[PDB]
Amino acid sequence: GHIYAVGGYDGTHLNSVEAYDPERDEWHLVAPMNTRRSGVGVAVLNGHIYAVGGYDGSPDGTNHLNSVERYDPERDEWRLVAPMNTRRSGVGVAVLNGHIYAVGGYDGSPDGSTHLNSVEAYDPERDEWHLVAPMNTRRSGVGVAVLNGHIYAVGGYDGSNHLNSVERYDPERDEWRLVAPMNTRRSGVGVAVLNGHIYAVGGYDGTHLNSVEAYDPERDEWHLVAPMNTRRSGVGVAVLNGHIYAVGGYDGSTNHLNSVERYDPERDEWRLVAPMNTRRSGVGVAVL
Incomplete structure (x- = not known):
């Protein structure tokens, strides 16, 4: 029932982590990560x-990271687990069938492949990562x-x-x-x-975007919905209590953002909520 904003960068690569309570409309810092991480992917699995x-x-x-750490909310502690096969900044992360998938990203290490189409899956029982089928397109800064x-x-x-x-x-x-492409x-x-749709929120069209679009899997179509109040590239999102929260990011035309806003799909409206303690672009966000 809380949103966690993890890492990011402030106009400083962050190890700090803060949690939002919707009932109190307040952000509180929790234990920081072992490692500072901007362009970090976050997922929730098994508490x-x-x-x-x-x-x-x-x-x-260490620059581009293959390392991975896990937060236990009961002990308020982060522990490093097995690293990925590939270093990935600007990585997307999803949880499916009890595994964590790391999708795309950028490997800027020496001998790195730069923009990645590869995808790997973490098995928490064995503490191991395995490469699976790669994407059709290389994607850094992917959602x-x-x-x-x-x-x-x-x-x-x-x-x-x-x-x-x-x-x-x-x-x-x-x-x-490949499925239908976005409008932007x-x-x-x-x-x-x-509510059965994928929302693509903000980003950068190389314009820092306030626009938001929704994907209907039944019709294979994207439609614009109400735009956010603030333009946000490098934004984190997550869903809590039926609303999408857009957290932080960068407005390149107040720069790095601590502001937060929430989308109500029934009314098609965005509303600002309490800002974070720290400005965070390239922030990871998850709900636990």
């Missing part, structure tokens, strides 16, 4: 939050979400290119299929699932 990859630009930092048993990879950027394309992963056949190209896009 724990996983922070996956990211970028540690601190002076003794992901799970709808009807499939993982959707939305937007991102590739080398040459900000993407409007979208593809869906079927875990049974281990394959990725979006990298650094937030993606969440609410």
Whole structure:
């Protein structure tokens, strides 16, 4: 019943983590991560939050990260678990069938492949990561979400290119299929699932975007809905109590954002809520 904002960057790569209580409309800092991570992916599995990859630009930092750490809310502690096969900043993360998927990203390590189409899956029982079928398109700054048993990879950027394309992963056949593209190209896009639709929130069309669009899987179509009050690239989203929360990001035309706003799908309206303690772009967000 809380939103967790994990890491990010402030105009400083962050290890701090703060939690939003909707009943009190307040953010409280909790235990910080072991590692500073901007462009981090976050997922929730079995009562724990996983922070996956990211970028540690601190002076003794490792830069593009393959490391992964898990938050236990009962002990208020983070523990490092097995690292991914590939370093990934700007990575998308989803949970499906008891496994965590790390999708795309950017490997800027020496000998790295730069923009990634690869995808790997974490088994918490064995503490191991395995590469699965790659996407059709390389996508850094990609958004992901799970709808009807499939993982959707939305937007991102590739080398040459900000993407409007979208593809869906079927875990049974281990394959990725392009579906309808978005109306707008979006990298650094937030993606969440609410009421049977995927929402693509904000991002960057290389314009920092306030626009929001919704995907109907029945018709394979994207439609714009009400725009956010603030333009946000590198935004985190999550769903709590029937609303989408857009958390932080960057408005490149007040820069790094601590503001937060919430979308009501019934009324098609965005409303600001309490801002975070820290400004965070490239922030990971999950609900636990």
